[PDB]
From a paper:
Hence, the cryo-EM 3D reconstructions of the nanodisc-reconstituted IP3R1 channels were determined in the presence of saturating IP3 concentration (10 μM), ~2 μM Ca2+ and 1 mM ATP (Ca2+/IP3/ATP-bound IP3R1; CIA-IP3R1), and using 20 μM Ca2+, as the sole ligand (Ca2+-bound IP3R1, Ca-IP3R1), at estimated overall resolutions 3.50 and 3.26 Å, respectively. One conformation, hereafter called ‘extended’, was observed in the apo- (ligand free) and Ca-IP3R1 structures. By contrast, in the CIA-IP3R1 structure, the ARM2 domain is moved ~30 Å towards the helical armadillo domain 1 (ARM1) from the same subunit and exhibits a conformation distinct from that observed in the Ca-IP3R1 or apo-IP3R1, which we have termed ‘retracted’. In the CIA-IP3R1 structure, we observe a strong density bridging the βTF2 and ARM1 domains at the site where IP3 is expected to bind. Superimposition of a single subunit from the apo-, Ca2+- and CIA-bound structures shows that IP3-binding causes rigid-body movements of all three LBDs resulting in a 4 Å closure of the cleft between the ARM1 and βTF2 domains. By contrast, in the CIA structure, only two cytosolic Ca2+ binding sites, Ca-IILBD and Ca-IIIS, were occupied with Ca2+ ions. The CIA-IP3R1 structure reveals a previously unseen ATP-binding site located at the interface between the ILD and LNK domains, where clear density is seen. The resolution in the ATP-binding site was sufficient to unambiguously identify the pose of the ATP molecule as well as coordinating residues in the binding pocket. This pose allows for the formation of hydrogen bonds between the negatively-charged ATP triphosphate tail and residues K2221, K2224, K2633, N2637, W2639. In contrast, only one W2639 side chain conformation was detected in the CIA structure, likely owing to the compatibility of the binding pocket to the ATP molecule. In contrast, in the CIA-IP3R1, the diameter of the ion pathway at F2586 constriction is ~11 Å. This pore expansion is achieved by 50° rotation of the F2586 side chain away from the four-fold axis and down toward the ER lumen.
Inositol-1,4,5-trisphosphate receptors (IP3Rs) are ubiquitous Ca2+ channels predominantly localized to the endoplasmic reticulum (ER) membranes. IP3Rs play fundamental roles in the physiology of a diverse array of organisms as they mediate the release of Ca2+ from ER Ca2+ stores in response to diverse physiological stimuli. Each IP3R subunit comprises the pore-forming transmembrane domains (TMDs) and cytoplasmic (CY) domains containing binding sites for ligands and multiple modulators of the channel. IP3 and Ca2+ are the primary agonists of IP3R channels and both are required for channel opening.
Author numbering:
A (entry chain B): 2173 to 2479, 2521 to 2654
B (entry chain A): 2521 to 2606
C (entry chain A): 2414 to 2461
D (entry chain A): 2221 to 2268
Amino acid sequence: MLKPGGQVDGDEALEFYAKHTAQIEIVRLDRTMEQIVFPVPSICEFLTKESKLRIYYTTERDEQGSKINDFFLRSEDLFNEMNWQKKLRAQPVLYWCARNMSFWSSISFNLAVLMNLLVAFFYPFKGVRGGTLEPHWSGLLWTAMLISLAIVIALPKPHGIRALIASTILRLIFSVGLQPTLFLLGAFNVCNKIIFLMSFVGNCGTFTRGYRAMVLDVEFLYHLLYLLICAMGLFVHEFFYSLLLFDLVYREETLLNVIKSVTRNGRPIILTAALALILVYLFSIVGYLFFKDDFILEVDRLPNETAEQDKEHTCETLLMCIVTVLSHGLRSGGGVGDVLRKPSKEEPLFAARVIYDLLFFFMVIIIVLNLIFGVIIDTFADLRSEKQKKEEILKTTCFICGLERDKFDNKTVTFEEHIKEEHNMWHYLCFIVLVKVKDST
Amino acid sequence: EQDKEHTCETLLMCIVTVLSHGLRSGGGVGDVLRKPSKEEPLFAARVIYDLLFFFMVIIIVLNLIFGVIIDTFADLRSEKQKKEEI
Amino acid sequence: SLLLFDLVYREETLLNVIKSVTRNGRPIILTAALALILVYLFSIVGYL
Amino acid sequence: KESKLRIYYTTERDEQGSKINDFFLRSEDLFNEMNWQKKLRAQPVLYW
Ligand SMILES: Nc1ncnc2c1ncn2[C@@H]1O[C@H](COP(=O)(O)OP(=O)(O)OP(=O)(O)O)[C@@H](O)[C@H]1O
Ligand SMILES: [Ca+2]
Ligand SMILES: [Ca+2]
Ligand SMILES: [Ca+2]
Ligand SMILES: [Ca+2]
Ligand SMILES: [Zn+2]
């Protein structure tokens, strides 16, 4: 009778009591283990799945190889989160706003992208009246008509709603005008961003931790900066919408992992850049001493108008002569010899010139400019190894007991069940929670 | 007759200029743009612009693309050797 | 000419070599998008 | 023999480290293959 889904009517009670009943295993002072069962609290049913996943992933092993300490240190945060979220469940439309964080973020990004493509394509707006693309209007019509239907065929409605939005925009780009359309979309984006900020403050509950806490957090100031940026973009210049594209690295995780390779080990990268600059300085010194007259660069002058010569000397002062090497030597693919004047074989210093060019090329372009790159591949290797190790740990061993997948073999406990009911990591949280709420009597 | 055309009149064409003649060139965008004299008020800013473009794009991103491919070779070889051992 | 594309299907080493770029193609595409974003910003500065 | 090698290579370990489940899931395909191939053995030049 204990198995749910009973054929005889009246199995609602058994299921309802099975849902609120948990079970753990603890130890005593005398190293004796005891099996414990008692009902879960009412407050613990308010935990969100996103918090479950965040706690499941961000927890890290300690020195001895136990996630128990860090898991316990996060219990207070989860308790406060549930206490605050219960109020939100029994609260007005603020809950409706807080439930749609993903929707607001998606609309904000799909706005910013489409309202930056227009700026990139059509600026400046000197000619917009009467079919901005005068020769392409015939080419515009069929493309705009054929864009919508193709997406919606093998795909649900929301992308069709996006296509309808695109149709509504394109029927107004040349009729109403492109600049009023951009102003309307900018105002829309500011409205959506302020709604998203309000929703984020509502969901996070930053107000309970004080002013200093809600101004010292990275994410809130992060979201406020692009509210300010959208305000400036609508009020100062349409080019400020370009900075909004930097949210792409935050929205995606693979981009964050890719970028983290260059900055996880950025100190050797910076020091290698400094070493390259030192080498460039030494070569500039040698060139200033010996080949000062060989530093002749071709240059074209601006239209004189207000007010012939074609070559200027660039090693007159040692700073300018360093700038020459640092600009035209590193960028050129064949060392500094590509930009410097090429001598004849009759020169007294022709052999020294060839030695100088080859030595510069081999020490800088071959060695240092590529030793910089080698570090990046090293950090990819390190990051992949770390990620695979974490994945193996989570998918093989147990969160609390720490026993690996094989030890639970043959024994009538299928590991995959050893964790489902016996050593479940969330029953421990529920039982810790109820201790903090039940009276001591 | 004329030999030079302006390519930053409209911002789309001026993006196309960088995306075509900047990425393909081995030394950043400074190879294709006109090279100024040292007497320009913005000569130092011009050098800063060229070096910054080169270092952020050609050195960093265009090679961070390639690093991923070698990472996937390492991953694939490890997987294949593991299967063969099993 | 399009018939030469059967070479990757006939051989296995070519398939394994090509599979490296597409097994993890999402970060490659996103890095290309990042490069395009940087190019856009530099074009804006140059236009200004 | 080609089916033998394909089953030997394409089978992959499960979460617990056992190829038994996937090997069993391919049994029906092999049975149907043998049933259909017996007809081909006793068939005209289509077998050639
Ligand atoms: N100690 C542990 N060792 C290993 N994995 C664990 C452990 N505790 C929990 N897990 C895994 O993390 C998941 C999170 O537990 P959760 O409360 O979500 O379980 P559930 O309610 O039975 O499952 P679901 O909500 O997915 O239907 C578990 O289902 C299990 O897969
Ligand atoms: Ca050069
Ligand atoms: Ca190299
Ligand atoms: Ca070129
Ligand atoms: Ca490179
Ligand atoms: Zn356990």
